[PDB]
Amino acid sequence: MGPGFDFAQAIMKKNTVIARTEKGEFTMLGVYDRVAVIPTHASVGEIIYINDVETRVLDACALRDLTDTNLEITIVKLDRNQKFRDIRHFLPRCEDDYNDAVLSVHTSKFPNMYIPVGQVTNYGFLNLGGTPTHRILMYNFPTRAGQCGGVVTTTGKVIGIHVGGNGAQGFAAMLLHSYFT
């Protein structure tokens, strides 16, 4: 309906796939080449379904910071016959706070879903399902089951992926440029 939704749509239409693991269906953001991200709680194995196609996982890495704390991001390399558009130049270099974000989801359950979540706080530490987690972003929107992996964008930047919520607030894991060099 406006410039925030326009940037979010441009990312969803070219840089997302529907990923299915034994833990359910997730929005999955493709970043470059055959490299994508998904929340670590999706529990990626040797085989994943991508848009309902059986796909071999060539490599998967659950990121942790240098303090050996969970970041809740898993980087996956897919055995797919097509590259993603390279969107690494839309990733922030540093931890930050942001105005006016959109959370965008695409699954069987929630196709073509765009949520104006508003201001985004560099929250930092979160006990996420009992797991100490760093580099969390927070927004005051009552996000729901089925939005995990959703892409958080501002106009011009891809800043995080949705990893959880408490009924009032939603939480995203930061995407940083340095994860994808």
From Swiss-Prot:
Catalysed reaction(s) here are: Selective cleavage of Gln-|-Gly bond in the poliovirus polyprotein. In other picornavirus reactions Glu may be substituted for Gln, and Ser or Thr for Gly
* Positions of the Peptidase C3 domain: 2-180
Q: Where, per UniProt, does this protein localize?
A: Host cytoplasm
The annotated active site, in chain numbering, is: 41, 72, 148
Domain of life, per lineage: Viruses
State the coiled-coil residue ranges. Answer: none
Q: Cite the record's note on assembly.
A: Interacts with host IFIH1/MDA5; this interaction inhibits host IFIH1.
Q: What does this protein do?
A: Major viral protease that mediates proteolytic processing of the polyprotein. Cleaves host EIF5B, contributing to host translation shutoff. Also cleaves host PABPC1, contributing to host translation shutoff. Binds and inhibits host IFIH1/MDA5, thereby inhibiting the type-I IFN production and the establishment of the antiviral state. Cleaves host MAP3K7/TAK1, resulting in inhibition of TRAF6-triggered NF-kappa-B induction. Cleaves host TICAM1; this interaction allows the virus to disrupt host TLR3 signaling. Cleaves host IRF7, resulting in inhibition of type-I IFN production.
What is this protein called in UniProt? Protease 3C
